[PDB]
């Protein structure tokens, strides 16, 4: 009766190859071959990772129960050894804003034909040794803009920044309508599609600003705690101190982003190891667009595209409206000056010739630590003793006179 697939016989697997392999690098959490279950509704096969750092456990997931995943999985999954916060922020915002049902409808309503929201498919869980592991699957996602930063010569280009800037602007407009701001636009928050290398998305949202607080009547606060958005990676001076809702900050990050990439690091976001100057330069530069633009960019009347954008962000306060539609035109109009065009390119190709990157980068990394002894339990004697009495001996003498 029924049959698997439409009907594609095997016949042959390799014409000029013969390796297959299997043993490369085992694991205890998420290895290559094991299957993972979603919210009790799916079962994706875990393949191999695509870059580790300090998040959790990124691995490729496929909707098949076959042997060996390899490069047959156009999806990524991030796992964490028990947690309830970070992933909760991305998951919530994902199902709410990254919902293929909402995005498809929204993008179709405005014909954005792009949007800056990742594609969410579902989430899963895995219990091991009594520990509950929570993970989430994503569309694709490949490398981050940080990797492209070096590919640009330690400094982005006027075309790239301007082009990428517009792509990000459309994102800030979406998250705003979803009650989400301060996504944190950086080279460590922006990533390019893996299965489709050409577009970029902005991660981190739920861990930023969900449009005003939850239970607060007073607008002013003046306390860097209610927000605590990031540390100092191009974050608004006010948003960092939890002063008034965050809205214009999204534009501030983009404004400084150009000078940071175009100029390559600045006296504030150099290392972030000394916020002392980072704060002073931020307040000064914020009101020195001309002083910074001249000190960061040439003085031969070359700039202008950014200046206009920075100006709007400097006056963006007595206009009420975010003025997003205008800002987009500022960075979009300049594209004509550089003989550029708004079609659908990010210029983030960074050498797309080949189809097989690896390079020598396979060393023995760490994982966990287990000692032979542990001061958790061994012997708990009794030092103190509670006993209210005055009898024990079977004699009891009698002396003196109680009077």
């Amino acid at each position: 009766g029924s049959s698997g697939s439409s009907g594609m016989p095997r016949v042959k697997a390799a014409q000029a190859g013969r390796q297959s392999s299997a043993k490369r690098h085992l694991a205890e959490q998420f290895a290559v071959g094991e299957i993972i279950t979603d919210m009790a509704k799916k079962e994706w096969k875990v393949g191999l990772p695509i870059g580790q750092g300090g998040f959790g456990c990124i691995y490729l997931a496929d909707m098949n129960s076959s042997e060996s995943v390899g490069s047959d999985a156009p999806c990524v999954v991030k796992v964490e050894p028990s947690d309830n916060g970070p992933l909760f922020t991305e998951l919530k915002f994902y199902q709410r804003a990254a919902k293929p049902e909402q995005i498809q409808k929204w993008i179709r309503t405005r014909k954005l034909k792009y949007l800056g929201v990742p594609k969410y498919w579902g989430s899963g869980l895995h219990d091991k040794n009594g520990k509950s592991y929570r993970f989430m699957i994503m569309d694709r996602f490949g490398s981050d803009l940080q990797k492209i930063y070096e590919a640009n010569a330690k400094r982005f280009s006027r075309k790239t920044v301007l082009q990428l800037s517009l792509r990000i602007l459309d994102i800030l407009e979406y998250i705003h309508e979803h009650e989400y701001v301060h996504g944190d636009i950086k080279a460590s928050n922006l990533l390019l599609n893996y299965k489709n290398p050409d577009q970029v998305y902005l991660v981190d949202y739920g861990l930023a600003y969900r449009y005003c607080p939850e239970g607060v009547h007073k607008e002013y606060k003046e306390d860097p705690k209610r927000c605590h958005d990031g540390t100092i990676e191009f974050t608004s001076i006010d948003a960092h101190n939890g002063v008034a809702p965050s809205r214009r900050g999204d534009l501030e990050i983009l404004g400084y982003c150009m000078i940071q990439w175009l100029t390559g690091h600045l006296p504030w976001e150099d290392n972030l190891k000394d916020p002392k100057y980072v704060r002073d330069s931020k307040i000064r530069y914020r009101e020195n667009i001309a002083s910074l633009m001249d000190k960061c960019f040439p003085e031969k009347n070359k700039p202008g595209e950014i200046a206009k954008y920075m100006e709007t962000v400097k006056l963006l306060d007595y206009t009420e409206k975010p003025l997003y539609e205008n800002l987009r035109d500022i960075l979009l109009q300049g594209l004509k000056a550089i003989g550029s065009k708004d079609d659908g390119k990010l210029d983030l190709s960074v050498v797309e010739n080949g189809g097989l990157k690896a390079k020598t980068i396979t060393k023995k990394r760490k994982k966990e630590i287990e000692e032979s002894k542990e001061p958790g339990v061994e012997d708990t004697e009794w030092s103190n003793t509670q006993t209210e009495e005055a009898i024990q001996t079977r004699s009891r003498t009698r002396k003196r006179v109680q009077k």
Side-chain angles (χ1 to χ4, degrees), residues 14-44:
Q15 64 208 261
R18 234 160 121 198
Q19 203 77 324
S20 311
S21 268
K23 312 271 106 167
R24 39 246 275 185
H25 198 57
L26 309 156
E28 221 132 326
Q29 290 165 323
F30 274 56
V32 189
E34 57 140 28
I35 311 183
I36 46 174
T37 45
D38 295 16
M39 237 104 207
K41 278 269 157 248
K42 276 114 135 164
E43 285 212 37
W44 310 63

PDB file of all heavy atoms in Angstrom, residues 14-44:
ATOM      1  N   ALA A  14      27.516   6.477  -3.904  1.00  0.00           N
ATOM      2  CA  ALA A  14      28.726   7.206  -4.265  1.00  0.00           C
ATOM      3  C   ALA A  14      29.233   6.781  -5.640  1.00  0.00           C
ATOM      4  O   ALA A  14      29.197   5.601  -5.988  1.00  0.00           O
ATOM      5  CB  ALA A  14      29.803   6.992  -3.210  1.00  0.00           C
ATOM      6  N   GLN A  15      29.703   7.752  -6.416  1.00  0.00           N
ATOM      7  CA  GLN A  15      30.216   7.478  -7.754  1.00  0.00           C
ATOM      8  C   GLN A  15      31.742   7.454  -7.756  1.00  0.00           C
ATOM      9  O   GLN A  15      32.358   6.628  -8.429  1.00  0.00           O
ATOM     10  CB  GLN A  15      29.711   8.531  -8.743  1.00  0.00           C
ATOM     11  CG  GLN A  15      30.217   9.935  -8.450  1.00  0.00           C
ATOM     12  CD  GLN A  15      29.258  11.010  -8.922  1.00  0.00           C
ATOM     13  OE1 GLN A  15      29.445  11.602  -9.986  1.00  0.00           O
ATOM     14  NE2 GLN A  15      28.224  11.269  -8.130  1.00  0.00           N
ATOM     15  N   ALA A  16      32.344   8.364  -6.997  1.00  0.00           N
ATOM     16  CA  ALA A  16      33.796   8.447  -6.910  1.00  0.00           C
ATOM     17  C   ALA A  16      34.246   8.695  -5.474  1.00  0.00           C
ATOM     18  O   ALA A  16      35.273   9.331  -5.235  1.00  0.00           O
ATOM     19  CB  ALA A  16      34.318   9.543  -7.829  1.00  0.00           C
ATOM     20  N   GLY A  17      33.470   8.186  -4.521  1.00  0.00           N
ATOM     21  CA  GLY A  17      33.807   8.362  -3.119  1.00  0.00           C
ATOM     22  C   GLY A  17      33.638   7.087  -2.319  1.00  0.00           C
ATOM     23  O   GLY A  17      32.950   6.161  -2.749  1.00  0.00           O
ATOM     24  N   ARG A  18      34.269   7.036  -1.150  1.00  0.00           N
ATOM     25  CA  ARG A  18      34.187   5.864  -0.287  1.00  0.00           C
ATOM     26  C   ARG A  18      34.862   6.128   1.055  1.00  0.00           C
ATOM     27  O   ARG A  18      36.051   5.854   1.228  1.00  0.00           O
ATOM     28  CB  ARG A  18      34.832   4.656  -0.972  1.00  0.00           C
ATOM     29  CG  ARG A  18      33.918   3.444  -1.055  1.00  0.00           C
ATOM     30  CD  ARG A  18      34.380   2.464  -2.122  1.00  0.00           C
ATOM     31  NE  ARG A  18      34.657   1.140  -1.567  1.00  0.00           N
ATOM     32  CZ  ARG A  18      35.392   0.217  -2.183  1.00  0.00           C
ATOM     33  NH1 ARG A  18      35.928   0.469  -3.371  1.00  0.00           N
ATOM     34  NH2 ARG A  18      35.594  -0.961  -1.608  1.00  0.00           N
ATOM     35  N   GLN A  19      34.097   6.662   2.002  1.00  0.00           N
ATOM     36  CA  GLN A  19      34.622   6.961   3.329  1.00  0.00           C
ATOM     37  C   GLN A  19      33.565   6.719   4.401  1.00  0.00           C
ATOM     38  O   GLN A  19      33.718   5.841   5.250  1.00  0.00           O
ATOM     39  CB  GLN A  19      35.105   8.412   3.393  1.00  0.00           C
ATOM     40  CG  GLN A  19      36.130   8.665   4.485  1.00  0.00           C
ATOM     41  CD  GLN A  19      37.512   8.163   4.114  1.00  0.00           C
ATOM     42  OE1 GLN A  19      37.657   7.131   3.460  1.00  0.00           O
ATOM     43  NE2 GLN A  19      38.539   8.897   4.531  1.00  0.00           N
ATOM     44  N   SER A  20      32.490   7.503   4.355  1.00  0.00           N
ATOM     45  CA  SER A  20      31.403   7.378   5.321  1.00  0.00           C
ATOM     46  C   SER A  20      31.856   7.809   6.713  1.00  0.00           C
ATOM     47  O   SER A  20      31.412   8.835   7.228  1.00  0.00           O
ATOM     48  CB  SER A  20      30.886   5.937   5.363  1.00  0.00           C
ATOM     49  OG  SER A  20      30.642   5.445   4.056  1.00  0.00           O
ATOM     50  N   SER A  21      32.741   7.021   7.314  1.00  0.00           N
ATOM     51  CA  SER A  21      33.253   7.325   8.646  1.00  0.00           C
ATOM     52  C   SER A  21      32.122   7.375   9.667  1.00  0.00           C
ATOM     53  O   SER A  21      30.945   7.308   9.309  1.00  0.00           O
ATOM     54  CB  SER A  21      34.005   8.657   8.634  1.00  0.00           C
ATOM     55  OG  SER A  21      35.388   8.461   8.388  1.00  0.00           O
ATOM     56  N   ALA A  22      32.485   7.493  10.939  1.00  0.00           N
ATOM     57  CA  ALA A  22      31.502   7.553  12.013  1.00  0.00           C
ATOM     58  C   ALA A  22      32.132   8.056  13.307  1.00  0.00           C
ATOM     59  O   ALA A  22      31.613   8.971  13.947  1.00  0.00           O
ATOM     60  CB  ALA A  22      30.870   6.185  12.227  1.00  0.00           C
ATOM     61  N   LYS A  23      33.253   7.451  13.687  1.00  0.00           N
ATOM     62  CA  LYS A  23      33.955   7.838  14.906  1.00  0.00           C
ATOM     63  C   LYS A  23      34.789   9.094  14.675  1.00  0.00           C
ATOM     64  O   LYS A  23      35.797   9.061  13.970  1.00  0.00           O
ATOM     65  CB  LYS A  23      34.852   6.697  15.387  1.00  0.00           C
ATOM     66  CG  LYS A  23      34.156   5.346  15.417  1.00  0.00           C
ATOM     67  CD  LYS A  23      33.464   5.104  16.749  1.00  0.00           C
ATOM     68  CE  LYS A  23      31.955   5.247  16.630  1.00  0.00           C
ATOM     69  NZ  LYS A  23      31.249   4.715  17.827  1.00  0.00           N
ATOM     70  N   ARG A  24      34.363  10.200  15.276  1.00  0.00           N
ATOM     71  CA  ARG A  24      35.073  11.468  15.137  1.00  0.00           C
ATOM     72  C   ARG A  24      35.198  12.176  16.482  1.00  0.00           C
ATOM     73  O   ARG A  24      36.266  12.679  16.832  1.00  0.00           O
ATOM     74  CB  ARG A  24      34.357  12.375  14.131  1.00  0.00           C
ATOM     75  CG  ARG A  24      32.840  12.315  14.222  1.00  0.00           C
ATOM     76  CD  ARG A  24      32.228  11.709  12.969  1.00  0.00           C
ATOM     77  NE  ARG A  24      32.025  12.707  11.921  1.00  0.00           N
ATOM     78  CZ  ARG A  24      31.417  12.453  10.764  1.00  0.00           C
ATOM     79  NH1 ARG A  24      30.953  11.237  10.502  1.00  0.00           N
ATOM     80  NH2 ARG A  24      31.273  13.417   9.866  1.00  0.00           N
ATOM     81  N   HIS A  25      34.101  12.212  17.233  1.00  0.00           N
ATOM     82  CA  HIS A  25      34.092  12.858  18.539  1.00  0.00           C
ATOM     83  C   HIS A  25      32.808  12.535  19.298  1.00  0.00           C
ATOM     84  O   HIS A  25      31.748  13.087  19.005  1.00  0.00           O
ATOM     85  CB  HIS A  25      34.238  14.374  18.383  1.00  0.00           C
ATOM     86  CG  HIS A  25      34.673  15.066  19.637  1.00  0.00           C
ATOM     87  ND1 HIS A  25      35.836  14.750  20.306  1.00  0.00           N
ATOM     88  CD2 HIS A  25      34.093  16.064  20.345  1.00  0.00           C
ATOM     89  CE1 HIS A  25      35.953  15.523  21.371  1.00  0.00           C
ATOM     90  NE2 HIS A  25      34.908  16.329  21.417  1.00  0.00           N
ATOM     91  N   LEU A  26      32.913  11.637  20.272  1.00  0.00           N
ATOM     92  CA  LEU A  26      31.760  11.240  21.072  1.00  0.00           C
ATOM     93  C   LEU A  26      31.311  12.378  21.982  1.00  0.00           C
ATOM     94  O   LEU A  26      31.894  13.462  21.970  1.00  0.00           O
ATOM     95  CB  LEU A  26      32.096  10.004  21.910  1.00  0.00           C
ATOM     96  CG  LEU A  26      32.698   8.837  21.127  1.00  0.00           C
ATOM     97  CD1 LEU A  26      33.513   7.942  22.047  1.00  0.00           C
ATOM     98  CD2 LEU A  26      31.603   8.038  20.435  1.00  0.00           C
ATOM     99  N   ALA A  27      30.270  12.125  22.768  1.00  0.00           N
ATOM    100  CA  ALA A  27      29.742  13.128  23.684  1.00  0.00           C
ATOM    101  C   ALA A  27      28.849  12.490  24.742  1.00  0.00           C
ATOM    102  O   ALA A  27      28.456  11.330  24.620  1.00  0.00           O
ATOM    103  CB  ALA A  27      28.974  14.193  22.914  1.00  0.00           C
ATOM    104  N   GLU A  28      28.531  13.256  25.780  1.00  0.00           N
ATOM    105  CA  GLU A  28      27.683  12.764  26.862  1.00  0.00           C
ATOM    106  C   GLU A  28      26.314  13.437  26.828  1.00  0.00           C
ATOM    107  O   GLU A  28      25.305  12.828  27.186  1.00  0.00           O
ATOM    108  CB  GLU A  28      28.355  13.009  28.215  1.00  0.00           C
ATOM    109  CG  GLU A  28      28.211  11.846  29.182  1.00  0.00           C
ATOM    110  CD  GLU A  28      29.528  11.457  29.828  1.00  0.00           C
ATOM    111  OE1 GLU A  28      30.575  11.575  29.157  1.00  0.00           O
ATOM    112  OE2 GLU A  28      29.512  11.036  31.003  1.00  0.00           O
ATOM    113  N   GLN A  29      26.287  14.692  26.396  1.00  0.00           N
ATOM    114  CA  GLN A  29      25.041  15.446  26.315  1.00  0.00           C
ATOM    115  C   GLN A  29      24.360  15.233  24.967  1.00  0.00           C
ATOM    116  O   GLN A  29      23.407  14.459  24.856  1.00  0.00           O
ATOM    117  CB  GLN A  29      25.305  16.937  26.540  1.00  0.00           C
ATOM    118  CG  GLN A  29      25.692  17.277  27.970  1.00  0.00           C
ATOM    119  CD  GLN A  29      26.299  18.660  28.096  1.00  0.00           C
ATOM    120  OE1 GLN A  29      27.036  19.110  27.217  1.00  0.00           O
ATOM    121  NE2 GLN A  29      25.994  19.345  29.191  1.00  0.00           N
ATOM    122  N   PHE A  30      24.854  15.923  23.943  1.00  0.00           N
ATOM    123  CA  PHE A  30      24.293  15.807  22.601  1.00  0.00           C
ATOM    124  C   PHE A  30      25.352  15.342  21.607  1.00  0.00           C
ATOM    125  O   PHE A  30      26.151  16.140  21.117  1.00  0.00           O
ATOM    126  CB  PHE A  30      23.711  17.151  22.152  1.00  0.00           C
ATOM    127  CG  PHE A  30      22.292  17.369  22.595  1.00  0.00           C
ATOM    128  CD1 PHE A  30      21.953  17.297  23.937  1.00  0.00           C
ATOM    129  CD2 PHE A  30      21.297  17.643  21.671  1.00  0.00           C
ATOM    130  CE1 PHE A  30      20.648  17.498  24.348  1.00  0.00           C
ATOM    131  CE2 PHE A  30      19.991  17.846  22.075  1.00  0.00           C
ATOM    132  CZ  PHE A  30      19.667  17.772  23.417  1.00  0.00           C
ATOM    133  N   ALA A  31      25.353  14.045  21.318  1.00  0.00           N
ATOM    134  CA  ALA A  31      26.316  13.473  20.383  1.00  0.00           C
ATOM    135  C   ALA A  31      25.769  13.474  18.960  1.00  0.00           C
ATOM    136  O   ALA A  31      24.748  14.101  18.677  1.00  0.00           O
ATOM    137  CB  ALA A  31      26.685  12.059  20.807  1.00  0.00           C
ATOM    138  N   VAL A  32      26.455  12.769  18.066  1.00  0.00           N
ATOM    139  CA  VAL A  32      26.040  12.688  16.671  1.00  0.00           C
ATOM    140  C   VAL A  32      25.336  11.368  16.382  1.00  0.00           C
ATOM    141  O   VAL A  32      25.968  10.311  16.343  1.00  0.00           O
ATOM    142  CB  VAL A  32      27.240  12.834  15.717  1.00  0.00           C
ATOM    143  CG1 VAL A  32      26.766  12.979  14.279  1.00  0.00           C
ATOM    144  CG2 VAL A  32      28.107  14.018  16.122  1.00  0.00           C
ATOM    145  N   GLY A  33      24.024  11.431  16.180  1.00  0.00           N
ATOM    146  CA  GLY A  33      23.258  10.232  15.894  1.00  0.00           C
ATOM    147  C   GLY A  33      22.029  10.106  16.774  1.00  0.00           C
ATOM    148  O   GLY A  33      20.986   9.625  16.332  1.00  0.00           O
ATOM    149  N   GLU A  34      22.153  10.536  18.026  1.00  0.00           N
ATOM    150  CA  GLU A  34      21.044  10.468  18.971  1.00  0.00           C
ATOM    151  C   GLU A  34      19.872  11.321  18.499  1.00  0.00           C
ATOM    152  O   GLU A  34      20.059  12.327  17.816  1.00  0.00           O
ATOM    153  CB  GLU A  34      21.500  10.929  20.356  1.00  0.00           C
ATOM    154  CG  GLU A  34      22.084  12.333  20.369  1.00  0.00           C
ATOM    155  CD  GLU A  34      21.656  13.132  21.583  1.00  0.00           C
ATOM    156  OE1 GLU A  34      21.388  12.515  22.635  1.00  0.00           O
ATOM    157  OE2 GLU A  34      21.589  14.377  21.482  1.00  0.00           O
ATOM    158  N   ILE A  35      18.662  10.912  18.867  1.00  0.00           N
ATOM    159  CA  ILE A  35      17.460  11.641  18.483  1.00  0.00           C
ATOM    160  C   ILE A  35      16.916  12.459  19.648  1.00  0.00           C
ATOM    161  O   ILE A  35      16.951  12.021  20.798  1.00  0.00           O
ATOM    162  CB  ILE A  35      16.355  10.685  17.988  1.00  0.00           C
ATOM    163  CG1 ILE A  35      16.924   9.702  16.962  1.00  0.00           C
ATOM    164  CG2 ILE A  35      15.196  11.476  17.395  1.00  0.00           C
ATOM    165  CD1 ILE A  35      15.884   8.771  16.376  1.00  0.00           C
ATOM    166  N   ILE A  36      16.411  13.651  19.343  1.00  0.00           N
ATOM    167  CA  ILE A  36      15.858  14.530  20.364  1.00  0.00           C
ATOM    168  C   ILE A  36      14.372  14.769  20.134  1.00  0.00           C
ATOM    169  O   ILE A  36      13.916  14.869  18.995  1.00  0.00           O
ATOM    170  CB  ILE A  36      16.587  15.887  20.402  1.00  0.00           C
ATOM    171  CG1 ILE A  36      16.767  16.440  18.987  1.00  0.00           C
ATOM    172  CG2 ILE A  36      17.932  15.746  21.098  1.00  0.00           C
ATOM    173  CD1 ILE A  36      17.340  17.839  18.956  1.00  0.00           C
ATOM    174  N   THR A  37      13.621  14.858  21.224  1.00  0.00           N
ATOM    175  CA  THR A  37      12.183  15.082  21.155  1.00  0.00           C
ATOM    176  C   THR A  37      11.837  16.533  21.468  1.00  0.00           C
ATOM    177  O   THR A  37      12.440  17.151  22.346  1.00  0.00           O
ATOM    178  CB  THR A  37      11.456  14.152  22.130  1.00  0.00           C
ATOM    179  OG1 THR A  37      12.110  14.135  23.386  1.00  0.00           O
ATOM    180  CG2 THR A  37      11.364  12.724  21.640  1.00  0.00           C
ATOM    181  N   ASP A  38      10.856  17.070  20.750  1.00  0.00           N
ATOM    182  CA  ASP A  38      10.419  18.441  20.956  1.00  0.00           C
ATOM    183  C   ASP A  38       9.433  18.490  22.122  1.00  0.00           C
ATOM    184  O   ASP A  38       9.574  17.728  23.079  1.00  0.00           O
ATOM    185  CB  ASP A  38       9.791  18.992  19.671  1.00  0.00           C
ATOM    186  CG  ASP A  38      10.797  19.100  18.542  1.00  0.00           C
ATOM    187  OD1 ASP A  38      11.880  18.485  18.648  1.00  0.00           O
ATOM    188  OD2 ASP A  38      10.504  19.803  17.551  1.00  0.00           O
ATOM    189  N   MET A  39       8.429  19.357  22.052  1.00  0.00           N
ATOM    190  CA  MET A  39       7.439  19.444  23.116  1.00  0.00           C
ATOM    191  C   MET A  39       6.475  18.263  23.018  1.00  0.00           C
ATOM    192  O   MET A  39       5.262  18.441  22.908  1.00  0.00           O
ATOM    193  CB  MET A  39       6.678  20.770  23.032  1.00  0.00           C
ATOM    194  CG  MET A  39       6.760  21.597  24.307  1.00  0.00           C
ATOM    195  SD  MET A  39       7.902  22.985  24.164  1.00  0.00           S
ATOM    196  CE  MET A  39       8.388  23.201  25.874  1.00  0.00           C
ATOM    197  N   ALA A  40       7.031  17.054  23.045  1.00  0.00           N
ATOM    198  CA  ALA A  40       6.232  15.843  22.944  1.00  0.00           C
ATOM    199  C   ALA A  40       5.414  15.848  21.660  1.00  0.00           C
ATOM    200  O   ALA A  40       4.276  15.376  21.637  1.00  0.00           O
ATOM    201  CB  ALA A  40       5.322  15.707  24.155  1.00  0.00           C
ATOM    202  N   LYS A  41       5.989  16.397  20.589  1.00  0.00           N
ATOM    203  CA  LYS A  41       5.285  16.468  19.312  1.00  0.00           C
ATOM    204  C   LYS A  41       6.192  16.161  18.119  1.00  0.00           C
ATOM    205  O   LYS A  41       5.711  16.036  16.993  1.00  0.00           O
ATOM    206  CB  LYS A  41       4.657  17.852  19.137  1.00  0.00           C
ATOM    207  CG  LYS A  41       3.320  18.007  19.845  1.00  0.00           C
ATOM    208  CD  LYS A  41       2.162  17.637  18.933  1.00  0.00           C
ATOM    209  CE  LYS A  41       0.925  17.249  19.730  1.00  0.00           C
ATOM    210  NZ  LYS A  41       0.604  15.802  19.586  1.00  0.00           N
ATOM    211  N   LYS A  42       7.499  16.045  18.352  1.00  0.00           N
ATOM    212  CA  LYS A  42       8.428  15.760  17.265  1.00  0.00           C
ATOM    213  C   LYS A  42       9.622  14.939  17.744  1.00  0.00           C
ATOM    214  O   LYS A  42       9.749  14.631  18.930  1.00  0.00           O
ATOM    215  CB  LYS A  42       8.919  17.063  16.635  1.00  0.00           C
ATOM    216  CG  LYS A  42       7.980  17.623  15.579  1.00  0.00           C
ATOM    217  CD  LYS A  42       7.362  18.942  16.021  1.00  0.00           C
ATOM    218  CE  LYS A  42       7.388  19.974  14.903  1.00  0.00           C
ATOM    219  NZ  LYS A  42       6.469  21.112  15.178  1.00  0.00           N
ATOM    220  N   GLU A  43      10.495  14.596  16.803  1.00  0.00           N
ATOM    221  CA  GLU A  43      11.690  13.816  17.095  1.00  0.00           C
ATOM    222  C   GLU A  43      12.758  14.088  16.042  1.00  0.00           C
ATOM    223  O   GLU A  43      12.787  13.447  14.992  1.00  0.00           O
ATOM    224  CB  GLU A  43      11.358  12.323  17.133  1.00  0.00           C
ATOM    225  CG  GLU A  43      10.615  11.896  18.387  1.00  0.00           C
ATOM    226  CD  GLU A  43      10.954  10.481  18.811  1.00  0.00           C
ATOM    227  OE1 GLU A  43      12.129  10.082  18.666  1.00  0.00           O
ATOM    228  OE2 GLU A  43      10.045   9.769  19.288  1.00  0.00           O
ATOM    229  N   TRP A  44      13.626  15.053  16.324  1.00  0.00           N
ATOM    230  CA  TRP A  44      14.686  15.423  15.393  1.00  0.00           C
ATOM    231  C   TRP A  44      16.000  14.733  15.742  1.00  0.00           C
ATOM    232  O   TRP A  44      16.314  14.529  16.913  1.00  0.00           O
ATOM    233  CB  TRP A  44      14.878  16.941  15.388  1.00  0.00           C
ATOM    234  CG  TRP A  44      13.599  17.702  15.217  1.00  0.00           C
ATOM    235  CD1 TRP A  44      12.527  17.707  16.064  1.00  0.00           C
ATOM    236  CD2 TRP A  44      13.255  18.570  14.130  1.00  0.00           C
ATOM    237  NE1 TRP A  44      11.540  18.523  15.572  1.00  0.00           N
ATOM    238  CE2 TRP A  44      11.962  19.065  14.385  1.00  0.00           C
ATOM    239  CE3 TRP A  44      13.915  18.977  12.968  1.00  0.00           C
ATOM    240  CZ2 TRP A  44      11.318  19.945  13.520  1.00  0.00           C
ATOM    241  CZ3 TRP A  44      13.274  19.852  12.109  1.00  0.00           C
ATOM    242  CH2 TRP A  44      11.987  20.327  12.390  1.00  0.00           C
TER     243      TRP A  44
END
